[PDB]
Nucleic acid binder design. Structure first.
Lengths: 120, 120
RNA sequence: UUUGCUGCUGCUGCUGCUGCU
RNA sequence: UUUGCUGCUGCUGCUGCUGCU
């Protein structure tokens, strides 16, 4: 078991749940991922566009959680790191080498927030 | 001559200029691009981290300029659109289908600004 | 604008490398 | 953390398509 950058578990909806959601309604949430070298950790999280929910999903990873997970993969040569998020058909990615990871985190967290607060 | 999304011309430094810059000093600027289907338009722009300069480079494209350039490429099937920017070893990308382009623009402009205002 | 996955398409991004500039 | 380009590497992102879920 590798250690993930994430502090919340995955919330991927089942196929049945997704169909039921489509018949009765606005996505159920958003997808995000962190990639270090060749390893990618992924989350689907429920998000309902309220403030409480935004605050919850914003705690799904931190500088520290990403750094502890990422450093597992560090070597002589710098590795590529990447955060990806998709909400409503819009994807943001923030990437660079492992030496920039603090800065990637900084931009990822703003991006996640800008995207999730974006009006339809 | 295709029509570009950009309102400023490219400012790529020569190899000699770049060497001279490296011997005497902090990058000379940043790189950005807009991709519609298979066509990508690219800029290198000088940016010195002042407010006046930030304002100048922020005018290098607009919603309208991106839309007029992009619509050249629209068909039956939605196309993939993407804005990419790299400054100080950190790359942001904003992508999606052509139906989301207004929203991509909205997130691209914020991203460009967050990244260029980021402290080293 | 959509749950998760398979295989294909075209175009980016990032990492490392290469040769010129 | 770096001007622009050539060719290679590995991993994403996006578009369209596919078969299951």
């Amino acid at each position: 078991h590798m250690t993930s950058p994430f502090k919340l578990p995955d919330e991927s909806p089942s196929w049945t749940e997704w169909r039921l959601h489509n018949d009765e309604t606005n996505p159920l949430g958003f997808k995000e991922s962190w990639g270090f070298g060749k390893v990618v950790f992924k989350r689907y999280l429920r998000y309902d566009r309220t403030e409480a929910s935004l605050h919850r999903v914003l705690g799904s990873w931190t500088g520290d959680s990403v750094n502890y997970a990422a450093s597992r993969f560090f070597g002589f040569d710098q590795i590529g790191c990447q955060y990806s998020i998709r909400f409503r058909g819009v994807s943001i990615t923030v990437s660079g080498g492992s030496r920039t990871l603090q800065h990637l985190c900084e931009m990822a967290i703003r991006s996640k927030q800008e995207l999730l607060q974006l009006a339809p």
